[PDB]
Design a protein around this ligand. Structure first.
Ligand SMILES: Cc1cc(=O)[nH]c2cc(-c3ccccc3F)ccc12
Ligand SMILES: [Zn+2]
Length: 209
């Protein structure tokens, strides 16, 4: 059911999605251990993900969440990196994409910083890096991230010093780093249907000059 439409680098849509990738790269406390050392990406391809059944499943949950939240879906566009990207675009988010040992509980994690999502592309902690070179910092192998449509509803705000249930009366968690002033937020949902993987982004990290 999924088809992938290539966006043209000349399309303004390509350009804004790229802009969202590039502008939300930050430094990481791990010095680049998990995701590699870089300031920017070489974007190789951006594809629109089209699945009518996954879309309808998303919008159905959105309306529900909306209605429970004073007509406010609190829909964001957020990054998600994961070794399961190929499975997610075809069958959608589920409990097997949940982070059991996450700071904010057992659910699916999403990030405002593209470089936060890039840390998970090879697994928790960057796993053992790219399959070809075992390099968490590989500048050669093609990586992929999702830029997703996420329904937050009433988000429970959790400060951090940086599948479960949502907190009673809440539809998601906002994990908001309180120490690193430059680290953007992360969000957790507990239902696969609250996220839609709209864009599939293919890229390399770029070695700094
Ligand atoms: C925090 C986070 C951001 C993100 O873009 N992707 C993640 C994936 C996971 C994850 C969960 C289960 C299996 C593999 C993963 F990479 C955990 C946390 C994140
Ligand atoms: Zn590699």
């Amino acid at each position: 059911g999924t088809i992938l439409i290539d966006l043209s680098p000349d399309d303004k849509e390509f350009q804004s999605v790229e802009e969202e990738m590039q502008s939300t790269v930050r430094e990481h406390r791990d010095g680049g251990h998990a995701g590699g050392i870089f300031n920017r990406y070489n974007i190789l391809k951006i594809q629109k993900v089209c699945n009518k059944k996954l879309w309808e499943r998303y919008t159905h949950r959105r309306k529900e969440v909306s209605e429970e939240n004073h007509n406010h879906a609190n829909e964001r566009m957020l990054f998600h990196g994961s070794p399961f990207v190929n499975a997610i675009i075809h069958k959608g988010f589920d409990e097997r994409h949940a982070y059991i040992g996450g700071m904010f509980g057992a659910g699916i994690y999403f990030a405002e910083n593209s470089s936060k999502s890039n840390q998970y592309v090879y697994g928790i902690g960057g796993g053992t890096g790219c399959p070809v070179h075992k390099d968490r910092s590989c500048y050669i192998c093609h990586r992929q991230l999702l830029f997703c449509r996420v329904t937050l509803g009433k988000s429970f705000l959790q400060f951090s010093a940086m599948m479960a249930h949502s907190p009673p009366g809440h539809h998601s968690v906002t994990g908001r780093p309180s120490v690193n002033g430059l680290a953007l937020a992360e969000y957790v949902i507990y239902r696969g249907e609250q996220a839609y993987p709209e864009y599939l982004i293919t890229y390399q990290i770029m070695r700094p000059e």
